[PDB]
């Protein structure tokens, strides 16, 4: 009754072009089998949506990758928030939206929109620059680093982290193999950032450590809740960004629209999120017997979401393939959706609008002028380079 497919959604011919292939996965049926992992996979925006939204039969505390934590040990100690269920999910979710929260974005918002201005006049001056190196990076790890309360030493291991915990959720091809044989440096780091002393006050992590009173979360809690924010934060901005900067270069109309009302700046990035979708894929583990798009799956399935393709569904979109800086995007699941849509998603707009705004306002023209590189991971989809041109305004 479900089609069975053999396309390979981890392959590398897959990350160099997917859309033909989300476009055949979503036109086989509302959920496939995906034969080479023995996966469910569900690729239009309805099925996306209903996964996401039924936590308690597609529950993530079995793991949000392909592996099943109750059939193979995790690579790392479990998340906390990513890879628990309602009710233990709850309070450390609640705990990591105060720390993250709307009064945290306006105590930190001037400054991060500084940064971002220095940075676009920084490049200017300089003209032909890698949009990924050194805006797309640069510029979260200008902000994100001291905003957390990290020390300078050893944050060049931030950014391989962050590869390492998206190649992970992956399966167990060379990418995934390969992200685990490098990751013991990075990985050392970015535990003992989590210790308590060695966040700077006033910073996020400070903040969930002092988050361990309430009833919420207990102090052996606090590594882990700032490792989620170490793990899942930095890499999937920068590809938002990067994105953003490239069809800001590939679609010049859009460009001219955001110059003549730089308030399109949050919504600009809000766009490149959709149809970028730095975060492709996430999976799901059933509890039960469910019922989805008149398929009956069984307990102990994996299921394979994708959101990029969601985002991209002509079900749900008009003109999916058009970067569009006044689309209303409200409903994307670029972030997610239910109870688990991403807790940091405040931060990465703030980050994104503010980096948009000051090209709003500074660049007439962002012109590729060097060869595109794409960068693959398991999990996440963003540029490795990117060089452009950048005329004054
Ligand atoms: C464009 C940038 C970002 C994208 C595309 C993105 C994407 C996502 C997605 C799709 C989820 C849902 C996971 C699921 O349903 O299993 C999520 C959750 C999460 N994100 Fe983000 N994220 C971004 C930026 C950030 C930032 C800046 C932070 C921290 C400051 C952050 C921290 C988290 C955390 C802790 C979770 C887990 C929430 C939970 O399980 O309740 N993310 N993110
Ligand atoms: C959305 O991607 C992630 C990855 C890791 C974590 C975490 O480690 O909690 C959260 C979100
Ligand atoms: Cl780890
Ligand atoms: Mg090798």
Redesign the pocket.
């Known amino acids: 009754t479900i089609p069975h497919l053999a396309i390979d959604p981890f392959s590398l011919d897959f990350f160099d072009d997917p859309y033909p292939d989300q476009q055949t996965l979503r036109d086989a049926g509302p959920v496939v089998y995906l034969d080479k992992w023995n996966v469910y996979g569900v690729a239009r925006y309805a099925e996306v949506h209903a996964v996401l939204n039924d936590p308690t039969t597609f529950c993530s505390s079995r793991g949000v990758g392909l592996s099943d934590f109750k059939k193979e040990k995790p690579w790392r100690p479990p998340?906390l928030?990513?890879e628990a269920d309602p009710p233990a999910h709850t309070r450390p979710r609640a705990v990591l939206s105060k720390v993250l929260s709307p009064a945290t974005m306006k105590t930190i918002r001037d400054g991060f929109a500084a940064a971002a201005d220095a940075k676009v006049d920084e490049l200017l001056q300089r003209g032909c620059i890698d949009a990924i190196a050194d805006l797309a990076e640069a510029y979260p790890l200008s902000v994100f680093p001291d905003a957390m309360g990290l020390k300078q030493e050893g944050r060049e291991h931030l950014l391989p982290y962050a590869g390492l915990?998206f190649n992970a959720f992956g399966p167990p091809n060379e990418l995934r193999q390969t992200a685990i044989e490098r990751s013991a440096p990075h990985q050392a780091y970015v535990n003992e950032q989590c210790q308590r002393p060695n966040l700077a006050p006033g910073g996020f992590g400070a903040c969930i450590h002092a988050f361990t009173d309430t009833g919420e979360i207990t102090p052996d809690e606090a590594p882990l809740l700032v490792?989620?924010l170490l793990?899942?934060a930095l890499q999937?901005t920068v590809n938002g960004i990067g994105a953003a900067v490239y069809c800001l270069a590939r679609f010049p109309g859009e460009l001219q629209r955001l110059r003549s009302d730089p308030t399109l700046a949050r919504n600009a990035f809000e766009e490149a999120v959709r149809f970028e979708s730095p975060?492709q894929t996430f999976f799901r583990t059933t509890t039960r017997e469910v019922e989805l798009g008149g398929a009956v799956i069984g307990e102990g399935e994996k299921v394979l979401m994708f959101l990029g393709s969601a985002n991209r569904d002509p079900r749900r979109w008009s003109d999916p393939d058009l970067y569009d800086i006044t689309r209303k995007t409200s409903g994307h699941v670029g972030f997610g959706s239910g109870v688990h849509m991403?807790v940091g998603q405040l931060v990465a707009r703030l980050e994104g609008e503010v980096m948009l705004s000051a090209l709003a306002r500074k660049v007439a023209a962002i012109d590729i002028d060097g060869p595109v590189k794409r960068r693959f991971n398991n999990t996440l989809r963003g540029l490795e380079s990117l060089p452009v041109k950048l005329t004054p305004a």
């Open positions: 998340s928030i990513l915990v490792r989620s793990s899942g999937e975060v991403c």
